Amino acid sequence: DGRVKIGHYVLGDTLGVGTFGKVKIGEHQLTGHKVAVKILNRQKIRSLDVVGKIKREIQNLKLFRHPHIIKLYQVISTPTDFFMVMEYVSGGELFDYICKHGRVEEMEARRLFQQILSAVDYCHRHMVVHRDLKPENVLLDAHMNAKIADFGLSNMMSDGSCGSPNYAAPEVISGRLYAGPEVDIWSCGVILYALLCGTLPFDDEHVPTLFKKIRGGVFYIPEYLNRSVATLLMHMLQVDPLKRATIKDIREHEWFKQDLPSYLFPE
Ligand SMILES: CCc1ccccc1C(=O)Nc1n[nH]c2c(C)c(F)c(C3C(C#N)=C(C)N(C)C(C)=C3C#N)cc12
Numbered sequence: 001d002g003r004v005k006i007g008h009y010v011l012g013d014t015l016g017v018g019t020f021g022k023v024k025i026g027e028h029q030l031t032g033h034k035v036a037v038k039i040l041n042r043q044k045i046r047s048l049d050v051v052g053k054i055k056r057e058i059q060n061l062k063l064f065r066h067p068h069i070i071k072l073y074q075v076i077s078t079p080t081d082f083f084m085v086m087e088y089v090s091g092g093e094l095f096d097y098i099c100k101h102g103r104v105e106e107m108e109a110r111r112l113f114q115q116i117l118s119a120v121d122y123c124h125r126h127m128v129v130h131r132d133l134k135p136e137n138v139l140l141d142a143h144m145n146a147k148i149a150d151f152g153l154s155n156m157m158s159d160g161s162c163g164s165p166n167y168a169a170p171e172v173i174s175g176r177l178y179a180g181p182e183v184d185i186w187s188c189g190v191i192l193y194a195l196l197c198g199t200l201p202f203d204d205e206h207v208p209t210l211f212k213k214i215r216g217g218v219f220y221i222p223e224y225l226n227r228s229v230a231t232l233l234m235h236m237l238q239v240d241p242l243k244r245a246t247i248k249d250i251r252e253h254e255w256f257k258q259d260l261p262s263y264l265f266p267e
């Protein structure tokens with residue numbers, strides 16, 4: 001041979017090095033279809049005692065059907081590794097696009113936020129969340145569609161933006177021993193803000209003062225911003241998660257409902 005071939009795919013460049021192993025671009029030997037293969041070292045899995053958990057994150061992610069969540073095609077099992085054959089998307093990180101292009105048009109921001117909000121709702125409904133939404137893990141494809149890695153502990157990948165603690169919800173910063181789905185609402189509020197303004201709502205070069213602005217919850221609403229989406233942002237970026245907007249609140253908002261495609265929320 002001479003090449004690392006698993007199943008029908010020949011592995012090539014390394015897209016990133018993560019927890020249980022590297023992620024490499026795969027290429028179907030017969031069709032040429034590009035693919036992203038997560039390599040899960042089984043000895044690493046057994047050292048963390050998450051064997052029964054990973055096999056249920058995989059078996060659960062295998063039953064995921066969402067156009068804006070990274071799809072799992074198949075899992076190939078060798079005695080030493082798990083090979084998760086997953087969708088490859090070449091558009092790069094969403095926030096890398098924003099930090100290089102600036103704000104997008106309001107219709108493009110609405111289309112992308114509706115895709116992201118639908119994927120987040122699908123994960124909260126169809127899986128046991130081991131991760132929270134990382135806005136750095138929001139990818140794009142070649143058609144400018146949002147692609148999200150599921151919230152399982154297998155997707156701890158980010159190797160290979162305008163800040164990093166900027167996407168940390170207040171209850172996460174305060175070390176609250178419990179956190180629910182409202183943490184992802186905050187992150188989506190950060191995402192929506194960057195889509196409409198071109199920057200992050202709480203950005204600060206000094207990290208301690210960055211945490212202070214997040215706890216204060218004061219962010220600059222530009223006057224050019226739509227007055228309706230301003231109310232949505234204020235509701236999503238509430239410091240107190242009890243007063244923070246929910247998915248049903250965002251789904252009912254007049255700005256979110258405009259030109260909403262039918263396939264996103266079949267519920
Ligand atoms: C954003 C870089 C990039 C830039 C330009 C072109 C392609 C990529 C890229 O890599 N695309 C991915 N396609 N399919 C992936 C899967 C299944 C992953 F699993 C990951 C994995 C990963 C790695 N390596 C990275 C870089 N990130 C941030 C995330 C969210 C991953 C996860 N989970 C990437 C792609």
Ligand SMILES: [Mg+2]
Pocket residue numbers: none
């Ligand atoms: Mg002070």
Ligand SMILES: [Mg+2]
Pocket residue numbers: 221222223
């Ligand atoms: Mg204003």
